[PDB]
């Protein structure tokens, strides 16, 4: 049942600089003791991002553009952002994809959904359990249906600092929505910590929808729904040139965005992290 | 070391073919489509 909130407020829009985020393993190719220069839809370094503080009435999930691919991050305490609606019009007018983590399974379906104007997880706040997927009610002319393996995730209201950081990377190609996951534990007061954290491929999703927009399904918290504390970002993926440093085990240890500043473009010309003193020729203007 | 790696990386030049792999043009393409693009990658690589 499509219900609404008692009040929906805009987030704090706290500005943040995502330093080393969005790095992932693009291919299936193991390489070792090497240094590989390539281009894909990456999050650029030092990206100017906004902290969507979702707090207690404040609930930021309208239509946000996707356009090729988005970066997502969320320092989490109450496990609020766990779903994303993908699609074009975000109404019951075109085919859309609702990927949810419903505290038990990852349920993915690609249909003309009876989309609510407020995409949320209808979750009882005092114990963190979901009553209904109040994002859709029914669906028509489907192409895909997926239910992952079972687990359990605690999604109640939590205090203290952020203890969980997940990194997500989405893109549309060949019908395959690619979804990758990064993770680290954290102890975080405000928006995001800096640091290098990679992502690994998790989903290959032949959904078949015109992915032009996205709506992040946040988790609603009320015992008239509300919410509670999480800070999540929206970043954009760009077809930029990265260097990829590979260690003994094929772990991406470090990277250079070639288009930040003339120092880093020089790094990509030399193909090293070490540059000697001098003048080196680079691309014409 | 630069002259070897220049010789290595010009294997991956497509030279106007659908790819730089002679075996993909051999096995995947139709044999009329093959012989034209085998002809392109040799004339590229031999003169490189």
């Amino acid at each position: 049942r499509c219900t609404t909130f008692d009040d929906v407020q805009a987030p704090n829009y706290t500005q943040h600089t995502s330093s080393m985020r969005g790095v992932y393993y693009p291919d299936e190719i193991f390489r070792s003791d090497t240094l590989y220069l390539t281009q894909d839809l990456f999050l650029p370094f030092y990206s100017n991002v906004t902290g969507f503080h979702t707090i207690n009435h404040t609930f930021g999930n309208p239509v946000i553009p996707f356009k090729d691919g988005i970066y997502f991050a969320a320092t989490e305490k109450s496990n609020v952002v766990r779903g994303w609606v993908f699609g074009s019009t975000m109404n019951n007018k075109s085919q859309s994809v609702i990927i949810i983590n419903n505290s038990t399974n990852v349920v993915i379906r690609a249909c003309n959904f009876e989309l609510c104007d407020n995409p949320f997880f209808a979750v009882s706040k005092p114990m963190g359990t979901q009553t209904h997927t109040m994002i859709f009610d029914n669906a028509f002319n489907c192409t895909f249906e997926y239910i992952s393996d079972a687990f359990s995730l605690d999604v109640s209201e939590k205090s203290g600092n952020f203890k969980h950081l997940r990194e997500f990377v989405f893109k549309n190609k060949d019908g395959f929505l690619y979804v990758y996951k990064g993770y680290q534990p954290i102890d975080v007061v405000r928006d995001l910590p800096s640091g290098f954290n990679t992502l690994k491929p998790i989903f290959k999703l032949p959904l078949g929808i015109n992915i032009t927009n996205f709506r992040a399904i946040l988790t609603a918290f009320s015992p008239i729904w509300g919410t509670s504390a999480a800070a999540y970002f929206v970043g954009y993926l760009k077809p930029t040139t990265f260097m990829l440093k590979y260690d003994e085990n094929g772990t991406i240890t470090d990277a250079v965005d070639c288009s930040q500043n003339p120092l880093a473009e020089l790094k990509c010309s030399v193909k090293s992290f070490e540059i000697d003193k001098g003048i080196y020729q680079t691309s014409n203007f | 070391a630069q002259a070897l790696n220049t010789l290595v990386k010009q294997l991956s030049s497509n030279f106007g073919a659908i790819s730089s792999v002679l075996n993909d043009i051999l096995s995947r393409l139709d044999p009329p489509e093959a012989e034209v693009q085998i002809d392109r990658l040799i004339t590229g690589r031999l003169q490189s």
């Binding site: 393993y25 299936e28 190719i29 193991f30 390489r31 070792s32 003791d33 090497t34 074009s88 019009t89 007018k93 075109s94 085919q95 003309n112 028509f140 002319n141 192409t143 549309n172 190609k173 060949d174 019908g175 395959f176 690994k200 491929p201 290959k204 032949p206 078949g208 929808i209 015109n210 992915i211 032009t212 003994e248 085990n249 094929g250 | 290595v8 294997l11 991956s12 075996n23 096995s27 995947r28 393409l29 139709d30 044999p31």
Partner: protein, 283 residues
């Protein structure tokens, strides 16, 4: 040259050649914008059933791309085009079929199988019930379906039918029986190519010998031997400091192997001369 001795065909669990009624036996096909998805999985397929059919006429594959098969799911997609829109069914090639109705991936590519249905799927006034998209705010990506039965806004402004100067996204094909081939309806099965494998058998690891090999996603000749390379769980194979593949995780048994190439070299000939003797030694 060292000439190889052995065949190494290593694949996960092998089934038979499946019957594919979705490929050559279906009776009615819909319009292209809302093309019906029918899919193939877990089959050692060759799609000779596209040929051996009483229901089709063209038999063309975008035709040795028939056996272009060691990859993920094949989607035997069902739709009816016009003869002037058969031509726009391709990976890329954004005419009115590929731009707005049905676009194909270009990693591997299968077969566009069509049939002359002038006596069944058309009429003398144009079978206008089949329609196709010619105008939408946004292009399709490859392998997408548009099921929008919605009046359309021609520039993103609130101008939908039934308001004036507000356009429908669908044109009539014009399936006329009184015209030539360019206006005729074709029932089209497209094998959209993006788990099957055509040459999929199972042989044994002929280790430490110059052999032929076919792996899931990998062909060539070389020397096969177990490897110590620390594959991530989401990694299929390895490459060297060049751009040649040197290691692979076994598609059958997950054994990490090395692939060194087969041996070769030049020949010198050592001789003291014909005035001295008539014998040689070779390097």
């Amino acid at each position: 040259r060292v000439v190889p001795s052995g065949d190494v065909v290593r694949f996960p669990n092998i089934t038979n050649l499946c019957p594919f009624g979705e490929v050559f036996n279906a009776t009615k096909f819909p319009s292209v914008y809302a093309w019906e998805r029918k899919k193939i999985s877990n089959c050692v397929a060759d799609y000779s059933v596209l040929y051996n059919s009483t229901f089709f006429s063209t038999f063309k594959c975008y035709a040795t791309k028939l056996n272009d098969l060691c990859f993920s799911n094949v989607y035997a997609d069902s739709f009816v085009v016009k003869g002037d829109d058969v031509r726009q069914i391709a990976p890329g090639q954004t005419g009115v079929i590929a731009d707005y109705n049905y676009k194909l991936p270009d990693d591997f590519m299968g077969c566009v199988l069509a049939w002359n249905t002038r006596n069944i799927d058309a009429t003398s006034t144009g079978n206008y019930n089949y329609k196709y998209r010619y105008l939408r705010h946004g292009k399709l990506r490859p392998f997408e379906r548009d099921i929008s039965n919605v009046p359309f806004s021609p520039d993103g402004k609130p101008c939908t039918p039934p308001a004036l100067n507000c356009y429908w996204p669908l044109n009539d094909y014009g399936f006329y029986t009184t015209t030539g081939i360019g206006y005729q309806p074709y029932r089209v099965v497209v094998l959209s190519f993006e788990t099957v494998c055509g040459p999929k058998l199972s042989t044994d690891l002929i280790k430490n010998q110059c052999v032929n090999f076919n792996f899931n996603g990998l062909t060539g000749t070389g020397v096969l031997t177990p490897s110590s390379k620390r594959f991530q769980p989401f990694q299929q194979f390895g490459r060297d400091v060049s751009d040649f593949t040197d290691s692979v995780r076994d598609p059958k048994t997950s054994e990490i192997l090395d692939i060194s190439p087969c041996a070769f070299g030049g020949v010198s000939v050592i001789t003291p001369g014909t005035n001295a003797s008539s014998e040689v030694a070779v390097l």
